[PDB]
Design a protein around this ligand. Sequence first.
Ligand SMILES: O=C(O)CC[C@@H](O)C(=O)O
Ligand SMILES: [Mn+2]
Ligand SMILES: [Zn+2]
Length: 444
Amino acid sequence: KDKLNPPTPSIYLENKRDAFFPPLHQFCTNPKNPVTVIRGLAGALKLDLGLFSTKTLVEANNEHMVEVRTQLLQPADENWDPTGTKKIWRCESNRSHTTIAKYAQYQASSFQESLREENEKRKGPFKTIKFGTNIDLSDNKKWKLQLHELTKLPAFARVVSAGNLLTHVGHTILGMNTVQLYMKVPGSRTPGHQENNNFCSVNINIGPGDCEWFVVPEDYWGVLNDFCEKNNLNFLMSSWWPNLEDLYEANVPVYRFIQRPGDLVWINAGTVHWVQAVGWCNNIAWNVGPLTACQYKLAVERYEWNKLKSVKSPVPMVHLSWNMARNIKVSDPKLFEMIKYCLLKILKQYQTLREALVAAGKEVIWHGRTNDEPAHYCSICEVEVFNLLFVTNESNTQKTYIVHCHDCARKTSKSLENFVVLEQYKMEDLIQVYDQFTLALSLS
Ligand SMILES: O=C(O)CC[C@@H](O)C(=O)O
Ligand SMILES: [Mn+2]
Ligand SMILES: [Zn+2]
């Protein structure tokens, strides 16, 4: 079907009015639109993309760290096994580190070398390329002008905003509520994935070259998971590059489009995607969590799925949920009932655990909390741990407070005799937050 190669939801901006126009906000967050390409976004805002040029980055922080992925330069939209014999899903992507100055040097000489080849005139085997990924632009002192330029965006697409759930986490989640930079040469590939905890993603192409994007709606992610599992690949942890003929045969629709310099790509919640550089360019990206039932639901679902797959969730959805209930007036009936349900479950599980401890003669020690203290995770299994923290007798005495979850503490120490139980929140206070959390009226 042509329904298997659908058109890209695409908004064409001319000026600031178009960018700040509220139906643009609603369009991007509509669950029916897996991706929105906002064309001409930088131009409409007079964004200085030059602040993100390789030349400026070198001058700014030439020793800054870059995660290098070394890859094969693959043809078009395909991924071949190294012997050029068959198209496979697994892609080779070895990791090392470099600096902006060193990667910049390669980016520039790669282009000069391509110019000479174009002037030398005229299955693999395949050349090797390097992709500069995940460059951390969280330090406002090192990247003042860069980060300030992005406050010019409409609020819904900003790294920080009142309506961004990731703003409401209350602490830094690297690469999610902080900007990541990518420095690319032709063929630089970001393999298939969903965002961390299915949060939306915002990507701007700095240029000067284009990127090519591949997008599959969230509700087909199970199909791609089976493909991975049948191909001996971890959907969440392995590097894979879909066979478009496999997807077509399985009746999976694939959105496919070009992102030009200054185009902003909005990846909606849970949308599966992979990307390749067509030319030489940089990109900047971060996540955003719109206050919708769809975003919260997909975030919760991935959070729970990660536990089953023994994968850490970068977004602490328990911590977030209490912050939402404490600080956000929620007027969507569906969203409200989702949050209320989740808090009630947290609350009851917590009450059950606490009572089991008390009834077994285990003491619960009041530990309180520092405000804006990040969520905790289990030092062993990396699950989020909320309120009741399990700390060894020695870590307690040393006041290092190395957190464990209950299961891991119990597996270590059968009667928890090697652990103390630290309580960060009084129950009455949590019950109060829950009770005071009611549906706000909005006429919108
Ligand atoms: O630009 C890339 O290659 C990766 C970025 C993409 O995963 C995004 O979510 O913005
Ligand atoms: Mn992404
Ligand atoms: Zn654990």
